[PDB]
Design an enzyme around this catalytic site. Structure first.
Site, PDB file in Angstrom:
ATOM      1  N   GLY A  10      14.808  -2.391  19.732  1.00 56.65           N
ATOM      2  CA  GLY A  10      13.870  -1.691  20.556  1.00 56.65           C
ATOM      3  C   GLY A  10      12.724  -0.979  19.844  1.00 56.65           C
ATOM      4  N   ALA A  11      12.243  -1.721  18.478  1.00 56.86           N
ATOM      5  CA  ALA A  11      10.909  -1.369  18.197  1.00 56.86           C
ATOM      6  C   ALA A  11       9.752  -2.523  18.360  1.00 56.86           C
ATOM      7  CB  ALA A  11      11.122  -1.292  16.448  1.00 56.86           C
ATOM      8  N   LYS A  12       8.753  -2.272  18.272  1.00 55.36           N
ATOM      9  CA  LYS A  12       7.855  -3.363  18.228  1.00 55.36           C
ATOM     10  C   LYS A  12       7.042  -3.762  17.042  1.00 55.36           C
ATOM     11  CE  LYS A  12       6.446  -1.697  23.066  1.00 55.36           C
ATOM     12  NZ  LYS A  12       5.032  -1.238  23.797  1.00 55.36           N
ATOM     13  N   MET A  13       6.842  -5.036  16.848  1.00 49.45           N
ATOM     14  CA  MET A  13       6.384  -5.396  15.633  1.00 49.45           C
ATOM     15  C   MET A  13       5.088  -6.128  15.793  1.00 49.45           C
ATOM     16  SD  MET A  13       8.359  -8.320  13.236  1.00 49.45           S
ATOM     17  CE  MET A  13       8.013  -8.909  11.711  1.00 49.45           C
ATOM     18  N   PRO A  14       4.077  -5.953  15.178  1.00 49.45           N
ATOM     19  CA  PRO A  14       2.822  -6.570  15.129  1.00 49.45           C
ATOM     20  C   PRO A  14       2.832  -8.232  14.679  1.00 49.45           C
ATOM     21  CG  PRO A  14       2.670  -4.528  13.908  1.00 49.45           C
ATOM     22  CD  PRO A  14       3.972  -4.711  13.988  1.00 49.45           C
ATOM     23  N   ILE A  15       2.402  -8.763  15.790  1.00 50.37           N
ATOM     24  CA  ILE A  15       2.346 -10.354  15.663  1.00 50.37           C
ATOM     25  C   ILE A  15       1.602 -10.712  14.577  1.00 50.37           C
ATOM     26  CG2 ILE A  15       3.297 -10.591  18.175  1.00 50.37           C
ATOM     27  CD1 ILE A  15       0.628 -11.821  18.687  1.00 50.37           C
ATOM     28  N   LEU A  16       0.638 -10.123  13.925  1.00 52.39           N
ATOM     29  CA  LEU A  16      -0.163 -10.614  12.873  1.00 52.39           C
ATOM     30  C   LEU A  16       0.113  -9.575  11.837  1.00 52.39           C
ATOM     31  CD1 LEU A  16      -1.988 -12.667  11.872  1.00 52.39           C
ATOM     32  CD2 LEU A  16      -3.921 -11.737  13.176  1.00 52.39           C
ATOM     33  N   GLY A  17       0.441 -10.339  10.481  1.00 53.69           N
ATOM     34  CA  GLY A  17       0.765  -9.381   9.212  1.00 53.69           C
ATOM     35  C   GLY A  17      -0.088 -10.308   8.194  1.00 53.69           C
ATOM     36  N   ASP A  44       3.638  -7.939   5.115  1.00 49.75           N
ATOM     37  CA  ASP A  44       4.811  -8.839   4.457  1.00 49.75           C
ATOM     38  C   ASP A  44       5.046  -8.666   2.857  1.00 49.75           C
ATOM     39  OD1 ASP A  44       7.290 -10.639   5.267  1.00 49.75           O
ATOM     40  OD2 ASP A  44       6.330 -11.885   3.650  1.00 49.75           O
ATOM     41  N   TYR A  49       8.157 -10.844  -5.374  1.00 52.94           N
ATOM     42  CA  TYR A  49       6.731 -11.336  -5.660  1.00 52.94           C
ATOM     43  C   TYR A  49       6.182 -10.423  -6.773  1.00 52.94           C
ATOM     44  CZ  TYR A  49       6.883 -13.059  -0.643  1.00 52.94           C
ATOM     45  OH  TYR A  49       7.580 -13.582   0.478  1.00 52.94           O
ATOM     46  N   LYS A  78      12.015  -7.849   1.742  1.00 49.39           N
ATOM     47  CA  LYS A  78      13.112  -8.699   1.560  1.00 49.39           C
ATOM     48  C   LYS A  78      13.922  -8.620   0.254  1.00 49.39           C
ATOM     49  CE  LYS A  78       9.887 -12.089   3.064  1.00 49.39           C
ATOM     50  NZ  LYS A  78       8.689 -11.533   2.206  1.00 49.39           N
ATOM     51  N   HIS A 111      16.373 -12.600   1.756  1.00 50.19           N
ATOM     52  CA  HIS A 111      15.187 -13.383   1.486  1.00 50.19           C
ATOM     53  C   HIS A 111      15.606 -14.829   1.833  1.00 50.19           C
ATOM     54  CE1 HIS A 111      11.217 -13.490  -0.975  1.00 50.19           C
ATOM     55  NE2 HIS A 111      11.388 -14.708  -0.063  1.00 50.19           N
TER      56      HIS A 111
HETATM   57  N1  LIG Z   1      10.420 -15.698   3.172  1.00 52.50           N
HETATM   58  C1  LIG Z   1      10.075 -16.470   2.436  1.00 52.50           C
HETATM   59  O1  LIG Z   1      10.702 -17.244   1.470  1.00 52.50           O
HETATM   60  C2  LIG Z   1       8.429 -16.865   2.244  1.00 52.50           C
HETATM   61  C3  LIG Z   1       8.243 -17.848   1.705  1.00 52.50           C
HETATM   62  C4  LIG Z   1       6.646 -18.351   1.808  1.00 52.50           C
HETATM   63  C5  LIG Z   1       5.683 -17.325   2.274  1.00 52.50           C
HETATM   64  N2  LIG Z   1       6.127 -15.975   2.606  1.00 52.50           N
HETATM   65  C6  LIG Z   1       5.339 -15.215   3.274  1.00 52.50           C
HETATM   66  O2  LIG Z   1       4.432 -15.647   4.106  1.00 52.50           O
HETATM   67  C7  LIG Z   1       3.107 -15.492   3.667  1.00 52.50           C
HETATM   68  C8  LIG Z   1       2.133 -16.543   3.774  1.00 52.50           C
HETATM   69  O3  LIG Z   1       2.605 -17.911   3.170  1.00 52.50           O
HETATM   70  P1  LIG Z   1       1.678 -18.330   1.954  1.00 52.50           P
HETATM   71  O4  LIG Z   1       1.307 -17.254   0.967  1.00 52.50           O
HETATM   72  O5  LIG Z   1       2.720 -19.461   1.358  1.00 52.50           O
HETATM   73  O6  LIG Z   1       0.521 -19.233   2.412  1.00 52.50           O
HETATM   74  P2  LIG Z   1      -0.428 -19.258   3.584  1.00 52.50           P
HETATM   75  O7  LIG Z   1      -0.830 -17.969   4.302  1.00 52.50           O
HETATM   76  O8  LIG Z   1      -0.298 -20.276   4.479  1.00 52.50           O
HETATM   77  O9  LIG Z   1      -2.146 -19.684   2.730  1.00 52.50           O
HETATM   78  C9  LIG Z   1      -2.462 -18.726   1.734  1.00 52.50           C
HETATM   79  C10 LIG Z   1      -3.424 -19.537   1.054  1.00 52.50           C
HETATM   80  O10 LIG Z   1      -4.562 -19.935   1.973  1.00 52.50           O
HETATM   81  C11 LIG Z   1      -5.730 -19.240   1.330  1.00 52.50           C
HETATM   82  N3  LIG Z   1      -6.431 -18.838   2.802  1.00 52.50           N
HETATM   83  C12 LIG Z   1      -6.154 -17.649   3.467  1.00 52.50           C
HETATM   84  N4  LIG Z   1      -6.856 -17.463   4.519  1.00 52.50           N
HETATM   85  C13 LIG Z   1      -7.970 -18.603   4.408  1.00 52.50           C
HETATM   86  C14 LIG Z   1      -9.022 -18.946   5.290  1.00 52.50           C
HETATM   87  N5  LIG Z   1      -9.454 -18.139   6.240  1.00 52.50           N
HETATM   88  N6  LIG Z   1      -9.712 -19.955   4.927  1.00 52.50           N
HETATM   89  C15 LIG Z   1      -9.260 -20.780   3.720  1.00 52.50           C
HETATM   90  N7  LIG Z   1      -8.307 -20.581   3.116  1.00 52.50           N
HETATM   91  C16 LIG Z   1      -7.596 -19.448   3.346  1.00 52.50           C
HETATM   92  C17 LIG Z   1      -5.297 -18.064   0.807  1.00 52.50           C
HETATM   93  O11 LIG Z   1      -6.557 -17.867  -0.336  1.00 52.50           O
HETATM   94  P3  LIG Z   1      -7.009 -16.638  -0.841  1.00 52.50           P
HETATM   95  O12 LIG Z   1      -5.622 -15.631  -0.859  1.00 52.50           O
HETATM   96  O13 LIG Z   1      -7.525 -16.931  -2.380  1.00 52.50           O
HETATM   97  O14 LIG Z   1      -8.228 -16.034  -0.059  1.00 52.50           O
HETATM   98  C18 LIG Z   1      -4.218 -18.868  -0.086  1.00 52.50           C
HETATM   99  O15 LIG Z   1      -4.652 -19.911  -0.984  1.00 52.50           O
HETATM  100  C19 LIG Z   1       3.405 -15.248   1.951  1.00 52.50           C
HETATM  101  O16 LIG Z   1       2.211 -14.665   1.364  1.00 52.50           O
HETATM  102  C20 LIG Z   1       4.477 -14.401   2.236  1.00 52.50           C
HETATM  103  O17 LIG Z   1       4.362 -12.998   2.640  1.00 52.50           O
HETATM  104  C21 LIG Z   1       7.646 -15.867   2.941  1.00 52.50           C
END
Ligand SMILES: NC(=O)c1ccc[n+]([C@@H]2O[C@H](COP(=O)([O-])OP(=O)(O)OC[C@H]3O[C@@H](n4cnc5c(N)ncnc54)[C@H](OP(=O)(O)O)[C@@H]3O)[C@@H](O)[C@H]2O)c1
Length: 316
Positions: A10-17, A44, A49, A78, A111
């Site tokens: 029933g809650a709303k989640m922002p599509i960009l985080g 997130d 982390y 997580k 996680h």
């Molecule tokens: N549930 C899980 O197991 C799991 C696993 C992986 C990720 N995640 C979550 O998802 C998030 C996003 O994934 P991710 O961190 O793997 O990678 P990502 O968001 O796909 O990519 C992050 C990388 O892209 C760069 N970047 C960001 N915006 C940019 C832009 N406009 N132009 C050029 N480069 C850009 C960042 O550089 P700078 O930071 O140097 O700007 C960084 O090196 C994670 O941080 C985490 O919160 C969850």
């Protein structure tokens, strides 16, 4: 494009985080402050982390400054694999709450489906280098997550990196009290996830796409690897729309009814990545981006392929 998606609690989640994996502790406080200043309302996080205290400093300062109200924020964390035991889940959640400066989480995820031996090490190893599993199953961990809802620590619970059979196990759990609200999975044009997304959406589970830019800062990156941000075909779609490649990569999952969590610690990019509510990809653009699938994974949990609950042997 609406800014929030309705969850099955029933809650709303922002599509960009804003993602925070690999955000250095000395940079993430400013990153989160900037993000909130430029409109982000969803962060997130995860205990693994090792930067939740610093994320929390930013959240608390923006609440104190009255830039946002708590009810307007959507904070996700997580449960790490070494806390799947029933008697450890609450304390793990409480440590995250303490670090984030919060009295509840909007969403708390398992996680990974793989439980590991509890202890100080996040990846406990045997003498031969294998991760040491826990004998606590997906369903008992889920029951412990349900208790967190009933104790007021979290508003919603969900899962991450669960394959469709593992999702189904939760959905078929005897005595299930709360369905997962979200399955957070890797998703981008090189790993398009059609089958798992369709399954989750058909069950009312919202999908969050992680690594939407292909995680160019992942620690195991090789120079030869595919690069979404440098793919000329994606750059061409971006040029046609007068947007950056990153903006196309963020808008793509949004138009699939997914939540998306790009990570940056660069102020200009944090702001850039949020400016994705002012253009539309055509259906042809969407199908073209989907056609780039290569089944390429940033996050394969490569050290855990023998774990009984390793998620990525199944096709989906
Ligand atoms: N549930 C899980 O197991 C799991 C696993 C992986 C990720 N995640 C979550 O998802 C998030 C996003 O994934 P991710 O961190 O793997 O990678 P990502 O968001 O796909 O990519 C992050 C990388 O892209 C760069 N970047 C960001 N915006 C940019 C832009 N406009 N132009 C050029 N480069 C850009 C960042 O550089 P700078 O930071 O140097 O700007 C960084 O090196 C994670 O941080 C985490 O919160 C969850």
């Amino acid at each position: 494009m609406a800014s929030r998606i309705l969850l099955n609690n029933g809650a709303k989640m922002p599509i960009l985080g804003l993602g925070t994996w690999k955000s250095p502790p000395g940079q993430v406080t400013e990153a989160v402050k900037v993000a909130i200043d430029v409109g982000y309302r969803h962060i997130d996080c995860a205990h693994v982390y090792q930067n939740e205290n610093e994320v929390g400093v930013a959240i608390q300062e923006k609440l104190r400054e009255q830039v946002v109200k708590r009810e307007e924020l959507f904070i996700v964390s997580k449960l790490w694999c070494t806390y799947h035991e029933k008697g450890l889940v609450k304390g793990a959640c409480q440590k995250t709450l303490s670090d984030l400066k919060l009295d509840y989480l909007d969403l708390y995820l398992i996680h990974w489906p793989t439980g590991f031996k509890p202890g100080k090490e996040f990846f406990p190893l045997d003498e031969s280098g294998n991760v040491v599993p826990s004998d606590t199953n997906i369903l008992d961990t889920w029951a412990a997550m349900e208790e967190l809802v009933d104790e007021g620590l979290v508003k919603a619970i969900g899962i991450s990196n669960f394959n469709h059979l593992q999702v189904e196990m939760i959905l078929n759990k005897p005595g299930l009290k709360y369905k997962p609200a979200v399955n957070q999975i890797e998703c981008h044009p090189y790993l398009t996830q059609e089958k798992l997304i369709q399954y989750c959406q058909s069950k009312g589970i919202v999908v969050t796409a992680y690594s939407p830019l292909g995680s160019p800062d992942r620690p195991w990156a090789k120079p030869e690897d595919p690069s979404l941000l440098e793919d000329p075909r994606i750059k061409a779609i971006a040029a046609k729309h007068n947007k950056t490649t990153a903006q196309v990569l963020i808008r793509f999952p949004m138009q699939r009814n997914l939540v998306v969590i790009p990570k940056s610690v660069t102020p200009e990019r944090i702001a850039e990545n949020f400016k994705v509510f002012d253009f539309e990809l055509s259906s042809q653009d969407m199908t073209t981006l989907l056609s780039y699938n290569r089944n390429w994974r940033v996050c394969a949990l490569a050290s855990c392929t023998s774990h009984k609950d390793y998620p990525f042997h199944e096709e989906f």
